[PDB]
Amino acid sequence: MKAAEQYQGAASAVDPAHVVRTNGAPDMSESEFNEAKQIYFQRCAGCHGVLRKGATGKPLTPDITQQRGQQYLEALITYGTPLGMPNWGSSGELSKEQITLMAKYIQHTPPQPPEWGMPEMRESWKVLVKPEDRPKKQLNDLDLPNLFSVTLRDAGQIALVDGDSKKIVKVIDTGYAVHISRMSASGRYLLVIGRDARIDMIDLWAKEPTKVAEIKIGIEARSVESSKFKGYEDRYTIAGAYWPPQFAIMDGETLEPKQIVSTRGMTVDTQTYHPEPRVAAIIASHEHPEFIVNVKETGKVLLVNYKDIDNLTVTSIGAAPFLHDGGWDSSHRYFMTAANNSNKVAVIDSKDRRLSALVDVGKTPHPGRGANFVHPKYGPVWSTSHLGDGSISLIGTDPKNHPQYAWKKVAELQGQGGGSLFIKTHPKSSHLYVDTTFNPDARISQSVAVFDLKNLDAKYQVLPIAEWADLGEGAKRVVQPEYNKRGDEVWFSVWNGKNDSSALVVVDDKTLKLKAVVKDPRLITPTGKFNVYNTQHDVY
Amino acid sequence: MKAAEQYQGAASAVDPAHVVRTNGAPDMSESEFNEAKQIYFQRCAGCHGVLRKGATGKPLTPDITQQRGQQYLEALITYGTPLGMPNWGSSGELSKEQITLMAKYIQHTPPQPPEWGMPEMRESWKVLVKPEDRPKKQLNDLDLPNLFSVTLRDAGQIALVDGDSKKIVKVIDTGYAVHISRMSASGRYLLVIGRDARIDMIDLWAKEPTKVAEIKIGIEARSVESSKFKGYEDRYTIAGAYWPPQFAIMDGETLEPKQIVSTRGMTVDTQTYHPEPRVAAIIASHEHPEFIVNVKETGKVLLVNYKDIDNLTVTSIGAAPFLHDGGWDSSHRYFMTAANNSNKVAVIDSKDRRLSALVDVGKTPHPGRGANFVHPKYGPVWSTSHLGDGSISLIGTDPKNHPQYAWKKVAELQGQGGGSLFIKTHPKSSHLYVDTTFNPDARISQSVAVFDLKNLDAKYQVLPIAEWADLGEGAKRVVQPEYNKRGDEVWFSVWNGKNDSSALVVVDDKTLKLKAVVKDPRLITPTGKFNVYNTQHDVY
């Protein structure tokens, strides 16, 4: 009756005088609030995050913002900061009236976007073609290993480009602005994820590659990955979300949602609670049946063991805050990940399940998956490009046979300048390609630098990738070099405007000569290109 | 710098129109809000939680509460429901004007108490006596294994009573309303955790037992535990918190804070995010170097492996919502814990790291640690009483030599009625005791039922514990039977008010006749009683 009521009726130990109401912000209309909120996610949420704690420095919470004041915040938004906070008034990007509204907005409690659990996922889950009715053999005659999965960012779709043919073979509708493409261990299924957290599974064996499953694992995402460990091929596919701060494990044949795990938790450096730790790069392990999951704001690398997904076991490894992209080393044991805004590179030992070291590097490293090669003096190494730096950092990745040079910034190369984004090579190649996508100089932003590994002390050659495309108007930012299955050509993307004309430019790695140019009215804002074989077997 | 700012300056994939502002509640003054907020934690937070999502039914969040309306909520609060929601108007416990305020308060966004990270812990952390300054031998002449640690709830302290002398040997100030007492594997250090989350470690080898370390792991807590795996004795001490939803691991010798882990995460039944999953019972594994941690609202049981404390591995086991108290079986392998308000008992396999079964029992089981004995027909069993009915459930715990009765509610026993909290026995005892602390009948609450393991079909005997104390005015509620080391005597608390007289009653287990009554002006609101040896070695 009420005996259990009296049992739990005791007063909470929490002192009510220490629980506080959240107000004290300047009055804002409903129309005004929504206008600043539209600006925040259009211009600010990328760094500061949904809850405004995703960047360095003091956060944009009420207690902090109200302490500064209306005019401090207006002043700091108008003129920015030399530590990565741009200026929105001096640049003319925002208006005096708008900046005033932003200063008022961040003094209010940050509005919350909704959660996304199993009910939301299962409703988003669609098996368009059931595995029973899927082909048992490759129907088409495509040379799938040398297929490129090219992202048509603004078009909300992806294009399959036959490597040798240089022609588009199909265009598939996907989530908006796909970020990466990943292959299943079998090589039959192509996985793509949009920044809106929609995943699509493509069957490369159908008469024409078709989608077979679909699911939305959140509101904002970046990464997807498939199980690579011996015996667990196509068993499970993982995907991490920016919001909600979580990742999800799904069946690898149907994408059925199985498990959802929150990444909300304590940070490695300060060991305080963080309400929005965004999941970034995910990579499958060869040593154990685990997914190595990067968690950005908390600086944790998680080892998600799918041996038993009903009773999940996770090992949380401390590294450095702001974990971002990364990739394997030549051995496929040591996961080199870039804690970009910590200017460090963490080394995750997938075998011993620990952090091998933290390597100091240049200003904001950005390697993507990186580039591995054998240095004459320093043995095997792993290299990264940089955004705030024009440098290239080489890191020893050979502890067994090169303890002298291991997890050390053994040597630097210098590229065309800052704004670099991806560094690329190939085992069969003697060159090292470095793009300058976000360099503020036009010429540099549409060129790439090529180093000669045969003689590494020489200066690089500059290749005019955009010039070779002969597009015309547009910024024509070049981005992301990728090799073919055979390794003797290097594909480039000219990330021109949505309403301008773009292209993919293919270079002969043997001669460093223009080999071909890919143009098509369907190839809108081409960004990421992913060779099936090279991506599937971590060739980089 | 602009390079990195353009790279991370892309608009968020989050639609601002789907990120909504949280204020549509009826206006309240600051004086009125703080009065309703005070009643909430004084009367309601125990069940509904800090964020109003800890009870069954629909939560008291703005979206739901505003939908009902002011008149609906006033009525429901005024009258209640027959499903665990007490009456507050018919009761006459809250005035008509307070209920109106409470109805408005729960329509506002719930106020939030602060977090409690490593900085807050370290400043709260005190080492009163260094390990170097502690004795290498037991200075005092006390029979430590037979000492009782008695909680003096309202006095904010505990008393150490000598089992055979029946006298109080010292009184030690602690956190407010200590909840449990635990002993180190070495049996030298007594650990007590306050209702307010303050932990005190007591050295029983000093000339007089003195506090040697102190730490606050949160704002509200209930549970504390020590590592009991071979080779890891006294190496780590763990404690769980109600708020913030987290647990923490400290050094066993100094209580230095080492790690903090957030229990915020997804539930087991709906697989949705819960922002306040408060930690409940915690027990130390013998099969592996792990802590078994109960997480209430999410219904998860976490196996926290301390093999490597810097890289913490945690297996998450699903069970049923509202996990609470629990205990070992006779084997010390299967953790029998009760999801109270799910009316089930979960069996967690300490060895295989999985859920062996979910057993349906009575309304709101409350076992504490439980009571193990050998049923003449059904083999080794684990028993529990309930709050919602006078039932006593027996559950087989022998899968090796009694597989047909394993994890089955093999039989039921009837006590005096509902409102029971603790059932007890001893390996050297022929009797089985059940209390009725929260029974609404005065005499029932003052008595305890006693069963005969030699003849289970016989009706219980009733011993009037409070009557035997001869205390006078007061509710004189009796609670928590506890044996001594030799199992000769059974101790009971008479949990009277702080301005009334209380006592500890001791009964001769071999004869069931009163053996002693402990009265003392320092014995204020005695609740928990913890024999050092029986608590240390999990004898129940």
Ligand code: DHE
């Ligand atoms: C987590 C993450 C990965 C690795 C996932 C993995 O390995 O599993 C990744 C890699 C990538 C890769 C993989 C290339 C590779 O070599 O693997 C590409 C092409 C890429 C195109 C872009 N990224 Fe990416 N990217 C983010 C996050 C990520 N970028 C951002 O947070 C940021 C700064 C904001 C955003 O706009 O998403 C960001 C900006 C960009 C771009 O502006 C690019 C150039 C175009 C776009 O669509 O946004 N990111």
Ligand code: DHE
């Ligand atoms: C999590 C938890 C444990 C086990 C910890 C472990 O094993 O590591 C426990 C066990 C206990 C034990 C251990 C006895 C045993 O045999 O193990 C005792 C004496 C006890 C005295 C009370 N408990 Fe307890 N108790 C709660 C939580 C807990 N009770 C509540 O949430 C609730 C309902 C609210 C509250 O007031 O704290 C609650 C009410 C009570 C009481 O009213 C008692 C009788 C007096 C008091 O201090 O509030 N609880």
Ligand code: HEC
């Ligand atoms: C990165 C791509 C950013 C974008 C886009 C915006 N901000 Fe930012 N901000 C950023 C960093 C790395 C820092 C801290 C660096 C430092 O030491 O200054 C900041 C700082 C602010 C602050 C100051 C908070 C404080 O320290 O007291 C405010 C008030 C702020 N930022 C607001 C803001 C607004 C309104 C933006 C767009 C409308 C915005 N920022 C964009 C990184 C980035």
Ligand code: HEC
């Ligand atoms: C247990 C010890 C409780 C205490 C003390 C309080 N409440 Fe409660 N409440 C409880 C349960 C188990 C339920 C659900 C039962 C059901 O019939 O659904 C509730 C329900 C409410 C509701 C209704 C929510 C809804 O579905 O709309 C309200 C508005 C509510 N409770 C408020 C409330 C207040 C204001 C209290 C003290 C001041 C309070 N409750 C105490 C459990 C317990």
Ligand SMILES: [Cl-]
């Ligand atoms: Cl579609």
Ligand SMILES: [Cl-]
């Ligand atoms: Cl955590």
Ligand SMILES: [Cl-]
């Ligand atoms: Cl393993």
Ligand SMILES: [Cl-]
């Ligand atoms: Cl979780």
Ligand SMILES: [Cl-]
């Ligand atoms: Cl082990």
